[PDB]
């Protein structure tokens, strides 16, 4: 067969014509809406920006998840690993982030909007189609690109689809806007790269992976940065997803991406089947870059929340199960259960951050201790419904619970009809 | 004494089932790594000759 | 013109073969490729025969054609060294990447030096106090020795090396050289901004008063750059040690990435792999690197190297080879970190050559050995306590478990560099306070105080001043009922006057991403190149 | 040092130098064994001489075996350690006693080089890291 | 081992005697055949022994 060269390093179309379009791992659209129109080609293999080109992460990227935005806060330009077993809610956190970027994009100016890229590597084509229907029926497809190298596609396409999506998001990073990229099952990209390496007869290393399987993910994840003021000031936030086997996070690809990304979101498989969804392992999951990039007010209450959940795990599952019960530390058990049931949150419903800090204010300051544990999820929506919406606008505009605001908040929090009790 | 031993041995069954469940996963990881490293040794030996 | 100019024969990833028809360069000699998008420096690794060398590219090879002219520089990779490198960031090949102009070179040195000879070895076991309790007690650091921080991806060997920078390099009188090998670029930018802010890196005209050189080969670089950037850091440190006669600090974050980059390029050099997948030359490459870091008779280098264990496997060959090169290993553990203990130093796996009674005194040595004995006796009881509980232990062993759970909270310590994400202020702990505290916990002077009074405190005074606050607080269950009444007309307006004094922002529909956009025309049929080079569509044959 | 020779092939040296240094030390120590005197030879880090031999033979493109060691890595240490003998009276009666050192990984005695040198030498001196931290110094198992 | 065995086979067949054949470490026969089998051109078997074990 005749092989023609194109004269160009491997490129994908980048630009504003990619928004709303489903794409394969090479740049051509698969949603059946014709070719990409308002677009231009750029390389998939770009060297990451250097040391001067970056600045410290200052601005917060709100996921809309209560357990995430309180305990592991994530700033713009960060890389946060979402790690956990199969069916523990990793994709749910990722798509709550995308839907919440749609919800916040209509209330900010255009220089503060976030344009999302969802790379689906090794997924089923049916789940990608259901996710496209979700992003269309939630209006989130206006700001979302979807790259789709499914399980039927060739393993070079599954290897290259994160780099294609990263170039499509690096357009938004380089043009001063803000990007958010989700590499869903980045473990499957390493499996595709291991396939390409073993079929190229390269000598395999640990777990038959190639030697440059760390370089494969470090190339990809170092391109998620927060650019300096002389480079437009744009940002790109990565959410790589790594699936573990039986909760083994000491695996090869797991510990490779842990030693690349800034923090982690450990989703425990034990809490996911105990109804605690999102099943955030609060003891293991950290975020040390968006810790300074936290919404104040949520920084005022969530530090005490994480401290109380820390001293809740001093009596964790040996309340009276092992030998004895104290009944002076009954309060930490019957308060940590309230802080746990406060952070549970149903799917496809992300919350604005000003309605999360008020809910954790009611859960932490003590406005819900007489509510039974079976109805704190109803007490939270009753608090959000019955408190007047002026305090939400004041807390969102001022950006902190002012001393002028906590008095009016404790006033509006003592006249709420907590059901039952 | 009998009723506290009945609970302490339930705690010991729980602990020695939990320890056994973790050690089974550790053995499975070591078994998988063992077949992988022995197979990689055989391929590296055969690729120096073939 | 044709002399000293080879051409690219084959491009295999970061490995380029160059055919020199006239005369071949030496091994380790640097070459430069003409007409690339960046400055592509190759380093000759092998002579393959048939007038062909085999090189390792310092940048990416994407865009290389197999006819490209390659110029022999006649020399290895030469980087600028001297006091003019202080306060500057430079990459693997000595180019300034800090956008502060060219580096004022005192000299240009080859990055490949032979290790200092046996007659130029200095054997002076002097202690270096770091302010860390577990480090100063159980494995003290030599003043001119090599230090390893072994860790398992998330256990804190970057926080520990930042705390060692915070504690040691400020009290030091010489120059520091930070070599960033294969770590995060965000971490290099954070260290640059913290060193500019703290004043150890000064910009502009006062650059000569900066006391630190950064050499950065981070994980966005190809494996040729991460394989030689430790050699650039060694060259900058060795100029201060040898020529300047200074005492140098050299912090190398992830010396594992040197080994990993050599194993990445080694699969394409046509070698048979050694054990679990590394290069056959692991031990000799690591030895040729680490024997250049030596306190000699004309200067000292205090080297602190973070070492990364790949899958929490200390039996992996790349940390197991590194273990034999170091005077003091500080093995950080994942389980100690999961207990909440920070720094997560394994006390029964970290060793030092300074833990000897004739060099640090018998009191400090006996205290460290007693603490290790109590911790080993607790680790022997870890299975009986799990499957039976503490109620079946002997009365002498419950005291061992209590004292060991006290000393393993007391080994933890807050850090001045961890105060930004933990909230608690850092604690610098003197050596005599550590020995005096652990004497008291070993002899039994603090069986009164609870176990959490020892957790994340500075010295033995702060244990007693935390057991006070832990028992004021349980008596502070009944102190008062807090209520602030008749307050709403002092300084706070209302709910609705506040929503009238907020500045609501303007929002715009149709965001306008077509501003400053090129928008080239991608046609439907894919464009290829014909034999004359013209951009034509595909022919209609398959 | 008046009675000691030190043969030093360090980590910076080439792989054949570290491969050949136990044979150099054994040849230097065989002079005292063959001239009626009594010798003591310590091969410190024989598990590093095996690693240097592994590198040297893998780069000669000989096929690898267990943990990518050569097949003849048993013969490497057997023909080295068998030179430690006690000669007869007609050969002088001189002796040479060997102290090879092997480093294990996490107490795994079932390693390849460790089991080979255990099968070669006469005695064993096991040093456990749990006896070391219990105050028992030397940590003789 | 073949040399000791053919001495014992002469003592069994020709002399007709009843022979003792003490073989110290017959494992070293297979070990010695394993040290040369990669150089004889044989790709290795299970754990590291020869294919002809
Ligand atoms: N917060 C939540 N509340 C209720 N149900 C949830 C929540 N999050 C996820 N689920 C449900 O649990 C399942 C988890 O699927 P999800 O795709 O989120 O997990 P995953 O880790 O991506 O699994 P996989 O990797 O196998 O696709 C889904 O069926 C989803 O409907
Ligand atoms: N001394 C410490 N105090 C508090 N937290 C720590 C400390 N050391 C490490 N950590 C936590 O552990 C993680 C270690 O990250 P890092 O320092 O990058 O280690 P590594 O380089 O091994 O991944 C950090 O996210 C931090 O939250
Ligand atoms: Mg999924
Ligand atoms: Mg690090």
Domains of chain C by residue range: 1-76, 78-353, 355-479
Say if residue A236 is in the same domain as residue A347. Answer: no
**C-alpha distances out from residue C312 to A212, A260, B28, C262, C334, Å:** 19, 16, 17, 21, 8
Same domain, A287 and A357: no
Q: How far apart are CA A249 and CA A269, in angstroms?
A: 12
Chain C residues touching residue B11 (CB < 8 angstroms):
389
Point out the catalytic residue in the list C54, C78, C133, C157: C157
Shared domain check, A250 and A309: no
**Would the CA dihedral through D60, D65, D69, D73 be positive or negative?**
negative
**C388/chain B closest Cα distance in angstroms:** 6
Q: Are the C-beta atoms of residues A222 and A78 closer than 8 Å to each other?
A: no
Q: Is D137 annotated as ligand-binding?
A: yes
Distance of CA E19 to the CA centre of its chain: 18
d(CA C334, CA C154) in angstroms, rounded, equals 8
CATH of the domain at A385: 1.20.150.20
> Does any CB of chain D come closer than 8 Å to the CB of residue E20?
no
What is d(CA A183, CA C30) in angstroms, rounded to the nearest whole number?
38
The residue nearest atom 20 of ligand 1, judged by CA position, is: A87
DSSP labels, D3-39:
S-------TTS-HHHHHHHHHHHHHHHHHHHHTT-EE
Which one of C135, C154, C337 would you pick to mutate in the ligand 2 pocket, going by the greatest count of ligand atoms within 8 A of its CB?
A: C154
User: Is A288 an active-site residue?
Assistant: yes
Q: Delineate the domains of chain B, giving CATH numbers in brackets.
A: 9-50 (1.10.287.80)
Region label for D22, one of left (φ > 0), alpha (ψ between -120 and 50) or beta (otherwise): alpha
Beta strands C15-19 and C52-57: pairing type?
antiparallel
**Catalytic site residue C451?**
no
Asked if C10 and C264 count as a contact pair (C-beta separation under 8 A), the reply is no
Residue keyed to tokens 């006819």: C67
Say how many residues make up chain C. 542
Question: What per-residue string of b and e applies to C407-435 under the rule 16 or more CB within 10 Å gives b?
Answer: bbbbbbbbbebbeeebeeebbbbebebbb
Let me know whether A39 and A187 are in one domain: yes
Query: Is-contact C209 C275, C-beta < 8 A?
Result: no
Cα(A240)–Cα(A166) distance, integer angstroms: 12
- Decide: C387 and B16 in contact? Cβ < 8 Å: yes
CA distance D9 to C326: 17
Judge B/C contact: 3 or more CB pairs < 8 A: yes
Kindly report whether the peptide bond that precedes residue D138 is cis, defined as omega within 30 degrees of 0.
Answer: yes
C365 marked ligand binding residue: no
Residue with tokens 């939630």: A138
Phi, psi values for residue D41, rounded to 5°: -120, 130
B9 contacts chain A (CB < 8 A): no
CATH classification (class only), C355-479: mainly alpha
- From first CA to last CA, the distance across chain A in angstroms is 78
**Dihedral sign computed on CA atoms, order A30, A31, A33, A39:** negative
Q: Quick one: fold of C78-353? A: Rossmann fold (3.40.50)
**CA distance, residue E35 to nearest chain B CA (Å):** 13
d(CA A293, CA E37): 63
Cα separations in angstroms, A15 against A23, A39, A147, C512, D87: 13, 5, 14, 12, 85
A290 with A387, same domain?
no
Contact A135, A91 (CB under 8 A): no
DSSP 8-state secondary structure symbol assigned to residue C26: P
For residue A4, being part of any structural domain is answered with no
Q: Whose CA is nearest to atom 7 of ligand 1?
A: A347
Q: Please tell me whether the peptide bond between C321 and the residue prior to it is cis, using omega within 30 degrees of 0.
A: no
C474 touches C402 (CB < 8 A): no
Same-domain check for residues A217 and A338? no
Beta-carbon count within 10 A of E19 CB: 12
Which pair of structure tokens corresponds to residue C399?
Answer: 């005291």
Angle at C125 between CA C119 and CA C128, to 5 degrees: 130
Find the Cα–Cα–Cα–Cα dihedral D108, D109, D114, D118, rounded to 10°: 170
Classify burial at D17, counting beta carbons within 10 Å of its beta carbon; exposed 0-12, middle 13-18, buried 19 or more: middle
Q: How far is CA B3 from the centre of its chain?
A: 34
Those residues with Cβ within 8 angstroms of residue E33's Cβ, 6 or more apart along the chain or in another chain: E50, E52, E53
Q: What is the C-alpha separation between D28 and D39, in angstroms, rounded? A: 10
In a domain, A407, yes or no: yes
Contact indicator for C168, C128 with CB cutoff of 8 Å: yes
Whether A272 and A302 share a structural domain: no
Q: Pick from A294, A328, A362: which residue ends a domain?
A: A294
Residue A222 falls inside a structural domain: yes
SS3 (DSSP) at D89: helix
Three-state SS annotation for C389-404: CHHHCCHHHHHHHHHH
Task: Choose among A113, A111, A94: nearest CA to A103.
Answer: A113
**Distance set, CA E16 to CA C269, E12, E22, E23 (Å):** 63, 5, 18, 21
Of D72, D85, D70, D68, whose CA–CA distance to D29 is shortest? Answer: D85
Closest CA of chain E from B32, distance in Å: 15
If one counts the domains in chain A, the total is 2
Comparing CB atoms, the residue among D64, D72, D112 nearest residue E35 is D72
d(CA C37, CA A207): 36
Q: Compute the distance between CA of residue B27 and CA of residue B39 in angstroms, rounded to an integer.
A: 18
Nearest to C254 by CA among C166, C148, C352: C148
Is C483 annotated in some ligand binding site? Answer: no
Which residues lie below 8 Å from residue C306, measured CB to CB, with a gap of 6+? C148, C149, C151, C157, C158, C160, C161, C252, C253, C254, C255, C256
CA quadruple C443, C446, C452, C457: dihedral sign: negative
Q: What residue owns the CA closest to ligand 2's atom 21?
A: C158
CA nearest to A62, candidates A270, A240, A290: A290
DSSP class of residue C381?
T
Residue in the structure block whose two tokens are 């999302």:
A116
* Cis, peptide link before residue C483, omega less than 30° from 0: no
Please, where are the H alpha helices in C328-424? 334-338, 362-380, 382-388, 395-410, 419-422
Given C284, C292, C380, which is nearest D55 (Cβ)?
Answer: C284
Distance spanning both ends of chain E, measured CA to CA: 15
A253/A330 same-domain check: no
Q: What does the block give as tokens for E4?
A: 């000791």
Asked whether the beta carbons of A262 and A78 are under 8 A apart, the reply is yes
Which three-class secondary structure string do you get for chain A? CCCCCCCCCCEEEECHHHCCCEECCCCCECCCCCCCCCCEEEECCCCCCCCCCECCCCCECCCCCHHHHHHCCCECCCEEEEEECCCCCHHHHHHHHHHHHHHHHCCCCHHHCEEEEEEEECCCHHHHHHHHHHHHHCCHHHCEEEEEECCCCCHHHHHHHHHHHHHHHHHHHHCCCEEEEEEECHHHHHHHHHHHHHHCCCCCCHHHCCCCHHHHHHHHHCCCCEECHHHCCCEEEEEEEEECCCCCCCCHHHHHHHCCCCEEEEECHHHHHCCCCCCECCCCCCCCCCCCCCCCCHHHHHHHHHHHHHHHCCCCCCCCCCCCCCCCCHHHHHHHHHHHHHHCCCCCCCCCCHHHHHHHHHHHCCCCCCCCHHHHHHHHHHHHHHCCCHHHHHHHHHCCCCCCCHHHHHHHHCCCCCCCC
CA dist A205 → B37, B44, D67 (Å): 9, 11, 12
SS3 of residue C46 by DSSP: strand
Give the H/E segment covering residue B8.
helix B2-49
Size of interface B-E (CB pairs under 8 A): 17
For residue C369, the SS3 value is: helix
DSSP C426-487: P----HHHHHHHHHHHHHTTTSSS-GGGSTT-SSHHHHHHHHHHHHHTTTTTSS------S-
Domain match, A277 and A159 both: yes
Domain that includes residue A357, residue range: 295-421
Rounded distance, CA A323 to CA C166, Å? 45
Last residue of a domain, one of A294, A319, A351: A294
Q: How far apart are CA A328 and CA C474, in angstroms?
A: 10
CA distances from A56 to A77, A220, C190, C423 (A): 9, 20, 7, 19
Chains with 3 or more CB pairs closer than 8 angstroms to C? A, B, D
Q: Let me know if residue A2 belongs to a domain.
A: no
> Looking at the DSSP assignment, which residues form a beta bridge with residue C161?
none
Nearest CA to D44 among D74, D4, D72, D71?
Answer: D4
CATH 3.40.80.10 fits C1-76, yes or no: no
CA distances from A337 to A299, A315, A320, A350, A414 (A): 21, 12, 15, 22, 21
Judge contact between C186 and A49, C-beta under 8 A.
Answer: no
Domain check: are A225 and A76 in the same one?
A: yes
Residues 6+ apart with CB under 8 A from C472: none
Q: Judging by DSSP bridges, how do beta strands A178-184 and A235-243 pair with one another? A: parallel
User: Alpha helices of C52-184 — where are they, by DSSP H?
Assistant: 133-138, 157-171
Q: Tell me the CA–centroid distance for residue C105 and ligand 2, in Å.
A: 36
Enter the tokens of residue A246.
Answer: 């039986």
Q: C203: which DSSP letter?
A: -
Chain D neighbors of B48, CB-CB under 8 A: 61-64
Q: Separation of A128 CA from ligand 3 center, angstroms?
A: 10
Residue C99 to residue A53: CA distance in whole angstroms: 10
Shared domain check, A301 and A160: no
E38 vs D66: CA distance, rounded Å: 12
User: Could you tell me if residue A3 is inside a domain?
Assistant: no
* Cα–Cα distance for residue pair C342/C412, rounded to 1 Å: 5
CA C331 remoteness from chain centre: 14
Spacing of C-alpha C279 from chain mean position: 22
Q: Confirm or reject contact between E26 and chain D (CB < 8 A).
A: no
**CB of D62 within 8 Å of any CB in chain E?**
yes
Residue with tokens 């190398």: C252
| CA–CA dist C266, C262 (Å, integer) | 6
Residues 6+ apart with CB under 8 A from A133: none
Ligand 1 pocket check for A347: Cβ under 6 Å: yes
Distant-in-sequence, close-in-space partners of C539: CB < 8 Å, separation ≥ 6: none
Residue linked to tokens 């339930």: B10
Identify the helix (H) or strand (E) that includes residue C307: strand C300-308
CATH number at residue A202: 3.40.50.300
Same domain, A27 and A100: yes
Cα–Cα distance measured from residue C486 to residue C500, given in angstroms and rounded to the nearest whole number: 24
> Distance between CA C441 and CA C406 in Å, rounded?
7
SS3 (DSSP) at E51: coil
**Could you count the other beta carbons within 10 Å of the beta carbon of residue A174?**
19
For residue D42, report the phi and psi dihedrals to the nearest 5 degrees: -115, 115
C498 touches D: beta carbon within 8 Å: no
CB atoms within 10 A of CB A301: 21
- How far B37 CA lies from chain E's nearest CA (Å)? 10
Q: Cβ contacts of residue C28 below 8 Å, gap of 6+?
A: C43, C44, C45, C76, C112
How many Å apart are CA C7 and CA C20, to the nearest integer? 7
How far is C218 from C229, CA to CA, in rounded Å?
A: 9
Spatial neighbors of C212 by CB under 8 A, at least 6 apart, are C86, C87, C169, C175, C176, C177, C178, C195, C200, C201
Q: A74-111 burial by CB neighbour count: b if 16+ within 10 A, else e?
A: bbbbbbbbbbbbeebbbbbbbbbbbbbbbbbbeeeebe
Question: What Å distances lie between residue C529 and C36, C252, C532, C534, C535, CA to CA?
Answer: 21, 48, 8, 5, 5
Looking at beta carbons, which residues of chain E come within 8 Å of B42? 43-44
Calpha distance D55→A389 (Å, rounded): 72
C291: helix, strand or coil: coil
Instruction: Please indicate whether, in this complex, the C-beta atoms of D71 and E47 are within 8 angstroms of each other.
Output: no
Kindly determine whether residue C389 and residue B40, on different chains, have CB atoms separated by under 8 Å: no
Listed resolution, Å = 2.9
C268 with C57: CB under 8 angstroms? Answer: no
Experimental method: cryo-EM
Other C-beta atoms lying within 10 Å of the C-beta of residue A324: 8
Q: What is the number of alpha carbons within 13 Å of residue E23 lying toward its C-beta?
A: 15
Domain boundary among A258, A277, A294: A294
Look at residue D100 and give its three-state secondary structure: strand
**DSSP conformation class of D86:** B
């Amino acid at each position: 067969d005749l092989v023609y060269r194109t004269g160009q390093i491997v490129n994908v179309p980048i630009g504003p014509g990619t928004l709303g379009r489903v794409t394969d791992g090479l740049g051509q659209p698969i949603d059946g809406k014709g070719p990409l129109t308002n677009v231009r080609s750029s390389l998939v293999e770009v060297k990451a920006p250097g040391i001067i080109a970056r600045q410290s992460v200052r601005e917060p990227l709100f996921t809309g998840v209560k357990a995430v935005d309180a305990l592991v806060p994530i700033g713009r330009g960060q890389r946060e690993l979402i790690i956990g077993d199969r069916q523990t809610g990793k994709t749910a956190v990722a798509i709550d982030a995308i839907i919440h970027q749609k919800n916040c994009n209509e209330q900010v100016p255009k220089a503060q909007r976030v344009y999302c890229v969802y790379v689906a590597v090794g997924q089923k084509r049916s789940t990608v189609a259901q996710l496209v229907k979700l992003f269309t029926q939630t209006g989130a497809m206006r700001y979302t690109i979807m790259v789709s190298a499914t399980a039927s596609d060739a393993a070079p396409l599954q290897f290259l689809a994160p780099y294609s999506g990263c170039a499509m998001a690096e357009y938004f990073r380089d043009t001063g806007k803000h990007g958010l990229i989700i590499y869903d099952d980045l473990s499957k990209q390493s499996v595709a790269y291991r396939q390409m390496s073993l079929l190229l007869r390269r000598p395999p290393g640990r777990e038959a992976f190639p030697g440059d399987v760390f370089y494969l993910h470090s190339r990809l994840l170092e391109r998620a940065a927060k650019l300096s003021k002389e480079l437009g000031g744009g940002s790109l936030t990565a959410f790589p997803v790594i699936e573990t086997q039986a909760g083994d996070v000491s695996a090869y690809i797991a510990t490779n991406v842990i030693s690349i990304t800034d923090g982690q979101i450990f989703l425990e498989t034990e809490l996911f089947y105990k109804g605690i969804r999102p099943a955030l392992n609060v003891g293991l999951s950290v975020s040390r870059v968006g810790s300074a990039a936290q919404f104040p007010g949520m920084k005022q209450v969530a530090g005490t929340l994480k401290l109380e959940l820390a001293q809740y795990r001093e009596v964790a599952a040996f309340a009276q199960f092992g030998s004895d019960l104290d009944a002076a530390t009954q309060y930490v058990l019957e308060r940590g259960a309230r802080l746990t049931e406060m952070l549970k949150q149903k799917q496809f419903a992300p919350i604005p951050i000003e309605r999360q800090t008020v809910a954790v204010y009611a859960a932490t300051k003590g406005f819900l201790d007489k509510v039974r544990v079976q109805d704190i999820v109803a007490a939270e929506e009753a608090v959000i419904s019955q408190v007047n919406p002026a305090v939400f606008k004041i807390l969102k505009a001022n950006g902190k619970i002012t001393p002028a605001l906590d008095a009016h908040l404790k006033a509006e929090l003592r006249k709420v009809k907590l059901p039952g009790a | 004494e009998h009723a506290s031993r009945m609970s302490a041995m339930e705690n010991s069954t729980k602990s020695a089932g939990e320890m056994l469940g973790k050690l089974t996963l550790d053995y499975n990881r070591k078994r998988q790594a063992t077949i992988t490293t022995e197979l990689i040794e055989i391929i590296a030996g055969a690729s120096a000759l073939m | 013109p044709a002399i000293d100019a080879g051409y690219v024969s084959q491009v295999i990833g970061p490995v380029v073969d160059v055919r020199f028809d006239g005369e071949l360069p030496s091994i380790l000699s640097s070459l430069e490729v003409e007409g690339h998008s960046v400055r592509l420096v190759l380093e000759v690794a092998q002579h393959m025969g048939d007038n062909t060398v085999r090189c390792i590219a310092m940048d990416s090879t994407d865009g290389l054609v197999r006819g490209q002219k390659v110029v022999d520089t006649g020399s290895p990779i030469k980087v600028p060294v001297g006091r003019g490198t202080l306060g500057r960031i430079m990459n693997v090949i000595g180019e300034p990447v800090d956008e502060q102009g060219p580096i004022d070179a005192a000299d240009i040195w080859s990055i490949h030096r032979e290790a200092p000879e046996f007659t130029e070895q200095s054997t002076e076991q002097e202690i270096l106090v770091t302010g860390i309790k577990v480090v100063d007690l159980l494995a003290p650091y030599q003043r001119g020795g090599k230090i390893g921080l072994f860790g398992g991806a998330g256990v804190g060997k970057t926080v520990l090396i930042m705390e060692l920078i915070n504690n040691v390099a400020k009290a030091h009188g010489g120059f520091s050289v930070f070599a960033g090998v294969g770590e995060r670029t965000r971490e290099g930018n954070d260290l640059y901004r913290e060193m500019i802010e703290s004043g150890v890196i000064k910009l502009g005209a006062e650059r000569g008063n900066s006391k630190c050189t950064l050499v950065y080969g981070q994980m966005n670089e190809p494996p040729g750059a991460r394989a030689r950037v430790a050699l650039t850091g060694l060259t900058v440190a060795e100029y201060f040690r040898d020529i300047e006669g200074q005492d140098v600090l050299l912090f190398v974050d992830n010396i594992f990435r040197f080994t990993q980059a050599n194993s990445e390029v080694s699969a394409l050099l046509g070698r048979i792999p050694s054990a679990v997948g590394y290069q056959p030359t692991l031990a000799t490459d690591l030895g040729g690197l680490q024997e250049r870091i030596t306190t000699t008779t004309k200067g000292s280098i205090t080297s602190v190297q973070a070492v990364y264990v790949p899958a929490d496997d200390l039996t992996d060959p790349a940390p197991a080879t590194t273990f034999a090169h170091l005077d003091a290993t500080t093995v950080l553990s994942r389980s100690i970190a999961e207990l909440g203990i920070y720094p997560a130093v394994d006390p029964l796996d970290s060793t030092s050559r300074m833990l000897n009674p004739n060099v640090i005194g018998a009191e400090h040595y006996n205290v460290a050995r007693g603490v290790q004995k109590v911790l080993q006796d607790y680790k022997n009881l870890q299975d009986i306590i799990a499957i039976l509980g503490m109620d079946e232990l002997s009365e002498e062993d419950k005291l061992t478990v209590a004292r060991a759970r006290k000393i393993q909270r007391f080994l933890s310590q807050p850090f001045q560099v961890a105060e930004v994400f933990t909230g608690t202020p850092g604690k610098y702990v003197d050596l005599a306070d550590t020995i005096s505290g652990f004497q008291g916990v070993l002899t039994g002077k603090y069986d009164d105080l609870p176990e959490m009074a020892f957790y994340m405190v500075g010295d033995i005074k702060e244990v007693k001043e935390k057991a006070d606050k832990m028992a004021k607080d349980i008596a502070s269950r009944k102190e008062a009922d807090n209520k602030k009444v008749s307050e709403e007309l002092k300084d706070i307006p209302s709910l609705d006057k506040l929503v009238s004094e907020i500045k609501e922002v303007v929002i715009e529909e149709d965001d306008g991403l077509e501003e400053d956009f090129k928008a080239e025309a991608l046609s439907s049929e894919t464009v290829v190149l014909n034999e004359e080079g013209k951009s034509v569509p595909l022919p209609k044959k398959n």
